[PDB]
Amino acid sequence: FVEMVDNLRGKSGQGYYVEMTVGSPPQTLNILVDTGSSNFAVGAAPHPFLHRYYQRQLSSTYRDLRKGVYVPYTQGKWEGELGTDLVSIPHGPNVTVRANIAAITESDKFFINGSNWEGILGLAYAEIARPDDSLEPFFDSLVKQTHVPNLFSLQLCGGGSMIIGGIDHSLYTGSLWYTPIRREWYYEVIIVRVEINGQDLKMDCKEYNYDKSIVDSGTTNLRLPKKVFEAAVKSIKAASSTEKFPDGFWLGEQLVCWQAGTTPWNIFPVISLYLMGEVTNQSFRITILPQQYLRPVEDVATSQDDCYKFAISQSSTGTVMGAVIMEGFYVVFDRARKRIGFAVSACHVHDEFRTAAVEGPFVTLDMEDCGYNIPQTDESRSHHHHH
C-alpha cells in the first residue's frame, strides 16, 4: 500500500487528518480521522478559523437530503444539513463513492485555531451516527459500493498512515495481537488487567471497563474511569515521589519542567493494559511509555526548559484509549473479523532503556467477565431496528 503510507498529518493535541475530495469538480479538504464517532461532517460555511470549506453550490453531484442534524458535545456542538455527494481519498484507494455528508452550518468550540482540518471522518459504526443509525457512515458506504476489504489501519506518529483495506507490514515490527470488538458501536474492547511499573492495580476488572472501554483516535488523552484514574495517579505519584508537583499538574492543568535534556524519564513508570485475547482465558498487553503520557508543550518564556502536560485524565464515560496511546502502535481496525490488532509501530516513541511493547499471551485460569453491562434505558429499549 505504498500510495497510502504518510497520508496523515497532525498531532495528538489537535488531531490527525487525511485528505478527502468531496463533490464535482473535486474540493480537497483535510479531514480529522475519528474512530470515536460515525458521521462524516465538513465545515460548509465561513468560520473565522477556516479559510476553505465545502461549498455545496459548487458541486454538480451534490444532493440535499432535506433534513438537518444537531450534534452536541460536553464541550461544544456542531449542526448542519444532511446530503450526499461523491467522495474519494486521493492518497487512498482508487475508488469514488456516494456518501452521506453533513454540511456543518454552525458550530461552537469545534473548529480550533491552527488545527488545519475542516471536517471529521467518523469511522465508528452506524449505531452511534446522528441523527440515528439509519444514516450510513462513510466506511460502510465505501465497502458496500466498492468491495475494498472491510478493514483499515492507523499508524499515528507523534505524520502517519491510514491504510484503507489492508495491513502494510512495513508499518510495524513484531507480532500483531488481536482483541475482540465487544460490540460494534464504538470500537469497544475489554481490558482484563492493569499494571503500573510491574505492579497490578488489583481492581475488579469490570472497574477497567466501566462503563465501556474504547479505542478513539479523536480523543487526545488516555482517559480512565474515576476509580482507576485515582489508583493510577497514586501509583505514578509514588514512583516519581522525588518530584513534588502541584495538584494542577495531575489534573492536566499545568506543565512541569526540567532543564533542557535533563528530564528524569526513569522515575515515571510504564503502564501496561492487558486486552482480552481472541482465545478465552488469554490476554496480551500493550505497554505505554511515560513519553506517551507526558507530553511536551513548548511555552513562550521557558525556552531553556523541556515542559510537559500530564495526558491521563479522569472519565465518567469509561476508558478511552486516545491518540497519545495509539501513537506507540500500529492499530488494525479489522471490522471484517470484529477485532482490533496492535503491534509496535515502525515510528517508535523512545526512552533510554524501555520500549513501548505489545506482548502475549498471558493465560488466566479464569477470568471473570470483565465487561460491564450498561443499564438499559427505556428510550433504547423502545426504538425498533428493522434492518
Ligand SMILES: CCCc1cscc1C[C@H](NC1=NC(C)(C)Cc2cc(Cl)ccc21)C(=O)O
Ligand atoms: C486527537 C484529536 C484532539 C482534538 C482535536 S479538537 C479537540 C480535540 C480534543 C478532543 N476533543 C474533541 N475531539 C473531536 C473528535 C474533534 C470531537 C470534539 C468535538 C467538540 Cl465540539 C469538542 C472537542 C472534540 C478530546 O476531548 O480529547
Ligand SMILES: [Zn+2]
Ligand atoms: Zn494530496
Ligand SMILES: [Zn+2]
Ligand atoms: Zn417497528
Ligand SMILES: [Zn+2]
Ligand atoms: Zn436501528
